[PDB]
Write a structure and sequence with these properties.
Chain B: It is found in: Nucleus; Cytoplasmic vesicle; Cytoplasm, Cytoskeleton, Microtubule organizing center, Centrosome; Peroxisome matrix. This is part of a larger assembly, with two copies of chain A. By secondary structure, the first copy, chain A, is mainly alpha-helical. Chain A contains 45 helices and no strands. In chain A, helix 13 runs antiparallel to helix 14.
Chain lengths: 886, 155
């Protein structure tokens, strides 16, 4: 080991003739046992390589080949050194890269090569990405940006900008942020963009500018505003005089949208509302409006005729900022009128849709009637065309804005009603078109929401027979129709509606079970169908209460003081009850008879059980039935039998763990049952349904899932580094494991409220043994994710947890904090996770030794974090996390 | 070898796509239109049953006008027969009532306007299904435009 290294070092210091074989001898001297016994050091061989390289280069075109093979061999040495683990320290390697790239004596190919090693090794390892200091970060950024500014241009320039985005990503992710004195540097780069035409690496530069402005938007707001005011005209000139590269266009539009957010947070218009106004900025806005108007009328701006969402948002924001040369809705109406083809009509409709959806008040009350008339004229074209769904969804937010206004005069409201009735009768036909099924039901629910057009008896005929299958648009239209209208008795119409909702073929599953619906939506409609007063039940149901760069907009609003976040039992139709019960039992027999172990899936049974428990909870919340007799109903028996028949899937899975085809169905039903449960303690039908679902669950499946937790716990592009918290390290089995932990945590935290067959004490014991100190390994991503999820879910303020359990949970925090102190993202994540155990740590009625030990450990770790923050070792996000936990 | 409508019904049943189903429907329609007597009275009920099953496919497809014309020709052939038994005539009346209540939807589609109007006219002229008050509502307002298909059945 040491003797071999000494011999290799001595051989490398000999003459060139001897070195010709000494290089190969040193390359072949490495071996697996040698590196196994060498684990510690690597700094010795690193500096040996350093001195060998410097002595080789110390002593034209001939030397280029020698440089090539020495670069190849040092690259091989770096790759093999970090093949297993990154033992080599990144500091000296980065200094070597810096001192070899700073000088112009080394060739550009060597610079590109060392950049490749920098990205593949330094920029691909989290430890290397995190151990770089702020001063080293900023000096490396400065030297690389100065190299990018060199007049020499080669193929590597687009490569160099790739570093620029990465390093800028590093300083804003691991450090608090470098000073603003470097901003002018980028300005000069922008000036360079005004001269060069290739723009090979300009996309990366623009992306780096966008991310840097997003990071630094917290401070230097005036500096950012003036920098934008002086830089955006250059970007406008480039856009005018460029080949319109898609990446360049999208990054430029992203920068423009960021600047609009900076200048006009949350659509602010006047100076007193928080927005910043200037003549140059207004001229820039007008020029950008003209450019967007020119560009939207292009083939490549969209076979597809739909414009991308970013363009629509940018155009709508510009229109809102400029609407009061004179601009207004008149030019929009003229463009709509003169659009003789769908190609030039769809973009304007999209712009109007987005503008009304985001800014309902941007449309004056005088122009709503002309807009409605032009939309009505453009709606029919003798058949279902491309623009038909666009117009259908454009009318939706127009109707919504009409709902959200009350200053309209009597004449105007009468005129809009006499136009909306014709709109209703026109849109009544064409519902059978399935390709616009989602769009049609958007209007029908919306208008009924505002009571603009009185519902007719013929509308109730639509939800009958096999005219349309029960889908989410259909049910969300039906519920809104039911809230503000009374179903006619033509005792039979309600029966037809119930039949259509529960249409069963006498061998395909009903569409309600096949597809997914929002939780507790069909059940409310079903229980109100039998209600004496459906409208009253509707008004009663929703009367119950409930428990990125966007946040920078609210931050600016708080800073400017524009938005103050602070200082702010019915009887039921008896006759329909037995009919509903008969339908339920019939579908129960149909589902049970055709059920099979393999061919029949399980999530359909889960959805049917959700429907049954929703109906039961709705009945319990009313005075229809009592809870005790609800427990004894045959609906409970069928719901239990559903999971009894579905448990054989888990029984087969626990024996055949290697199976990879059932994982999708199991994860589907597992996500469904997680969405079924509700952890809120308020008196709501959701709580009753969750309790029923928990009490349905048997102990055998609980034990099986707890055992397979331990069974599976033993299993063994991006510009910069990979976040350890990212999902790319998580496979399908990992996703199943995490949502399985979610389900089990919800079950253990919500079962104690009611009476269940299974005992939660042993379940919690297994959960804690899953994260046992001997078993848990902080170095593993899966184990760390499981620990964070368990810490997030186990604590609960409703009922105090045992102090032994919470101290056992808190014990493995110290080592994972120590091993991941250099990574800011994991620190902020764990700080966000640890704040939910305080609600149970605060309750200390039984002041024992364990309580004092747990609170002392928490106090010590919080104090250590506070001291670390006082040492300027944590980024701003860590500071917000610490403030939140305090 | 034995040949008959049984193989035609089998081909209709096994046709999983409109490519292999439209030609057989066209052949049946032509045979019924030209030679009504070629279809024995025993197989008309299974033929109508398979046609009713093949009529809906969750949207307006290419085979829909062909199925509509086939049903029209079947109704026309049923018009020119009087030897049917009481049980068979009652069963076909019930099946035609089901077809009547099914065919109301999709009337707004102008592409299959002519076929829908022809089928409705065939059923009404044959007196297979008693007309309802909802039928008169169809020719009201601006839901459909007056045309030759809209008046040939109306008269």
């Amino acid at each position: 080991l040491n003797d071999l290294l000494i011999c290799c070092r001595q051989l490398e210091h000999d003459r060139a003739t001897e070195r010709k074989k000494e290089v190969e001898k040193f390359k072949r001297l490495i071996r697996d046992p040698e590196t196994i016994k060498h684990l510690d050091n690597w700094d010795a061989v690193f500096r040996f390589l350093q001195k060998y390289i410097q002595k080789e280069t110390e002593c034209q075109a001939s030397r280029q080949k020698k440089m090539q093979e020495i670069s190849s061999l040092v690259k091989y040495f770096i790759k093999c050194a970090n093949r297993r683990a990154p033992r080599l320290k990144c500091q000296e390697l980065l200094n070597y890269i810096m001192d070899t790239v700073k000088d112009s004596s080394n060739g550009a190919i060597y610079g590109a090569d060392c950049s490749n090693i920098l990205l593949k090794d330094i920029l691909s390892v989290r430890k290397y990405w995190c151990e770089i200091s702020q001063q080293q970060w900023l000096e490396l950024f400065s030297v690389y940006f100065r190299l990018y500014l060199k007049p020499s241009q080669d193929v590597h320039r687009v490569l160099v900008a790739r570093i620029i985005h990465a390093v800028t990503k590093g300083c804003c992710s691991q450090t608090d942020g470098l000073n603003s004195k470097f901003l002018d540097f980028f300005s000069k780069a922008i000036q360079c963009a005004r001269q060069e035409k290739s723009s090979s690496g300009l996309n990366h530069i623009l992306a780096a500018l966008t991310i840097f402005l997003k990071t630094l938007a917290v401070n230097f707001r005036i500096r950012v505003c003036e920098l934008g005011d002086e830089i955006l005209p250059t970007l406008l000139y480039i856009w005018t005089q460029h080949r319109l590269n898609d990446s360049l266009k999208e990054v430029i539009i992203e920068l423009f949208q960021l600047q609009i957010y900076i200048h006009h947070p949350k659509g602010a218009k006047t100076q007193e509302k928080g927005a910043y106004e200037s003549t140059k900025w207004r001229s820039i806005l007008y020029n950008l409006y003209d450019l967007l108007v020119n560009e939207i009328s292009h083939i490549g701006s969209r076979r597809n005729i739909a414009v991308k969402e970013n363009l629509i948002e940018l155009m709508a924001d510009i229109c809102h900022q400029v609407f009061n040369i004179e601009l207004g809705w008149e030019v929009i109406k003229d463009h709509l009128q003169k659009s003789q083809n769908d190609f030039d009509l769809v973009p304007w409709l999209q712009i109007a849709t987005q503008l009304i959806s985001k800014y309902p008040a941007s449309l004056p009350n005088c122009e709503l009637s002309p807009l409605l008339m032009i939309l009505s004229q453009l709606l029919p074209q003798q058949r279902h065309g491309e623009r038909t769904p666009y117009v259908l969804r454009c009318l939706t937010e127009v109707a919504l804005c009409q709902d959200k206004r009350s200053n309209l005069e009597s004449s105007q409201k009468s005129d809009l009603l006499k136009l909306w009735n014709k709109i209703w009768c026109i849109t009544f036909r064409g519902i059978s078109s399935e390709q616009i099924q989602a769009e049609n039901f958007g209007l029908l629910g919306a208008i009924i929401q505002g009571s603009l057009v009185e519902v007719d008896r013929e509308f109730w005929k639509l939800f009958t027979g096999s005219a349309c299958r029960p889908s989410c648009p259909a049910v969300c239209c039906l519920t809104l129709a039911l809230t503000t209208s009374i179903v006619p008795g033509t005792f039979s119409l309600k029966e037809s509606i119930m039949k259509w909702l529960l249409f069963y073929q006498l061998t395909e599953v009903p569409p309600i079970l096949h597809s997914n619906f929002p939780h507790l939506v069909l059940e409310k409609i079903l229980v109100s169908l039998t209600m004496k007063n459906c409208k009253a039940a509707m008004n009663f149901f929703q009367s119950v209460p409930e428990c990125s760069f966007s946040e920078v907009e609210e931050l600016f609003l708080q800073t400017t003081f524009d938005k103050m976040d602070f200082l702010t039992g019915f009887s039921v139709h008896q006759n329909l009850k037995e009919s509903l019960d008969r339908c339920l039992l019939g579908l129960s027999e149909q589902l049970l008879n055709n059920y099979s172990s393999e061919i029949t899936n399980s999530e359909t049974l889960v959805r049917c059980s959700r429907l049954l428990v929703g109906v039961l909870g709705c009945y319990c919340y009313m005075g229809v039935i009592a809870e005790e007799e609800a427990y004894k109903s045959e609906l409970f028996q069928k719901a239990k039998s559903l999971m009894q028949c579905a448990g054989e899937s888990i029984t087969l899975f626990k024996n055949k763990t290697n199976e990879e085809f059932r994982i999708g169905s199991l994860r589907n039903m597992m996500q469904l049952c997680t969405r079924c449960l509700s952890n809120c303690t308020k008196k709501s039908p959701n709580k009753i349904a969750s309790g029923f679902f928990l009490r349905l669950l048997t102990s055998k499946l609980m034990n099986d899932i707890a055992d397979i937790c331990k069974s599976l716990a033993s299993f063994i592009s991006t510009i910069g580094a990979i976040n350890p918290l990212a999902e790319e390290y998580l496979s399908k089995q990992d996703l199943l494991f995490l949502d399985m932990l979610k389900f089990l945590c919800l079950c253990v935290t919500t079962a104690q409220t009611n009476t269940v067959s299974f005992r939660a004490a042993d379940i919690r014991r297994k959960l804690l043994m899953l994260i046992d100190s001997s078993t848990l390994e902080p170095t593993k991503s899966l184990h760390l994710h499981m620990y964070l999820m368990l810490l997030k879910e186990l604590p609960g303020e409703e009922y105090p947890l045992p102090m032994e359990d919470v101290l056992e949970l808190l014990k493995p925090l110290s080592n994972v904090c120590s091993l991941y102190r250099r990574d800011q993202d994991v620190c902020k994540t764990i700080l966000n996770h640890v704040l939910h155990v305080v609600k149970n740590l605060g309750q200390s009625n039984m002041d024992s030794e364990n309580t004092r030990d747990a609170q002392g450990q928490f106090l010590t770790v919080i104090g250590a974090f506070w001291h670390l923050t006082k040492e300027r070792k944590y980024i701003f996000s860590v500071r917000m996390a610490l403030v939140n936990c305090l």
